[PDB]
Amino acid sequence: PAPEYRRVPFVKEDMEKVMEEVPEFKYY
Amino acid sequence: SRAVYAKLWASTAQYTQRRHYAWYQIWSRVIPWSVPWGIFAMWMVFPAMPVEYRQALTFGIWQKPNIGTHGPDP
Ligand SMILES: CCCCCCCCCCCCCCCCCC(=O)OC[C@H](COP(=O)([O-])OCC(O)COP(=O)([O-])OC[C@@H](COC(=O)CCCCCCCCCCCCCCCCC)OC(=O)CCCCCCCCCCCCCCCCC)OC(=O)CCCCCCCCCCCCCCCCC
Ligand SMILES: CCCCCCCCCCCCCCCCCC(=O)OC[C@H](COP(=O)([O-])OCC[N+](C)(C)C)OC(=O)CCCCCCCCCCCCCCCCC
């Protein structure tokens, strides 16, 4: 028996709101 | 994702500011060398100054050496 995979649908979002969920990262 | 790639691209946008910070650090390490060399400059150029200025700059500690010659004439 194979597992019952849950669907993940594609959705398009505003990048300037997705940028509030990006981890903080520093190089300098 | 566009967002993550944008963050990674932007990570180094402020190169010039980091370089100014580097200037600051290295000059802070370097600049105290001015004190030894400054003392030696002053050491060499002190006997060129007027006798009054030698007396003043040493707060009156320095005076003409006494070697037993050229005393007053009655
Ligand atoms: C004791 C126990 C034993 C311990 C042993 C331990 C081991 C170590 C040894 C220690 C023992 C003693 C040893 C003796 C050492 C000293 C003697 C010595 O060294 O003499 C040397 C001796 C030098 O003699 P000299 O030059 O005639 O000396 C003349 C004096 O220097 C007179 O010259 P001068 O009077 O013209 O000097 C000028 C001086 C004059 O100095 C002074 O008058 C200073 C006075 C000092 C006061 C002292 C203060 C400290 C004490 C205070 C007490 C505190 C009290 C509290 C503690 C007690 C109570 C709790 O002023 C300056 O230097 C400039 C002033 C300061 C400059 C910085 C600027 C500051 C500005 C101030 C700003 C503030 C505002 C002022 C403005 C006014 C308006 C407000 O050697 C020689 O004579 C030459 C020898 C020949 C050899 C030649 C060398 C080789 C060349 C060959 C080279 C060619 C070959 C090729 C190259 C080869 C390469 C390899
Ligand atoms: C980077 C620095 C390089 C330094 C290279 C310099 C080497 C050569 C120095 C020559 C000095 C000559 C001074 C000219 C005046 C006459 C001197 C003289 O004998 O006068 C009579 C006097 C005695 O006077 P007198 O008794 O003959 O009568 C005249 C009386 N007065 C002086 C009051 C007018 O003799 C001396 O005291 C000897 C002169 C000592 C001065 C030495 C100066 C050294 C300079 C080095 C300092 C460098 C600091 C760093 C600077 C760098 C900045 C970017």
Side-chain angles (χ1 to χ4, degrees), chain A residues 25-28, chain B residues 4-15:
Chain A
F25 169 86
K26 294 184 71 172
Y27 192 89
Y28 299 155
Chain B
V4 187
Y5 283 133
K7 185 75 171 179
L8 301 180
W9 303 337
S11 294
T12 58
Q14 290 168 48
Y15 169 95

Side-chain angles (χ1 to χ4, degrees), chain B residues 7-69:
Chain B
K7 185 75 171 179
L8 301 180
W9 303 337
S11 294
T12 58
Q14 290 168 48
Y15 169 95
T16 311
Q17 322 308 331
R18 186 61 185 80
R19 262 275 159 174
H20 289 302
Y21 192 39
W23 294 7
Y24 159 68
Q25 288 190 3
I26 277 62
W27 269 111
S28 75
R29 297 209 291 266
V30 165
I31 194 150
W33 280 109
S34 51
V35 179
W37 260 286
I39 303 151
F40 205 108
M42 255 306 298
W43 204 357
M44 272 291 292
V45 305
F46 182 88
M49 312 188 307
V51 185
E52 296 74 336
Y53 285 180
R54 290 176 241 170
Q55 285 163 317
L57 183 139
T58 62
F59 310 107
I61 295 175
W62 185 97
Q63 308 273 308
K64 286 193 180 183
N66 189 353
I67 57 163
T69 64

Side-chain angles (χ1 to χ4, degrees), chain A residues 12-28:
Chain A
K12 284 195 171 178
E13 318 183 53
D14 185 2
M15 188 185 72
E16 292 185 25
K17 289 306 192 78
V18 178
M19 278 183 161
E20 307 179 348
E21 308 187 329
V22 174
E24 171 64 324
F25 169 86
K26 294 184 71 172
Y27 192 89
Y28 299 155

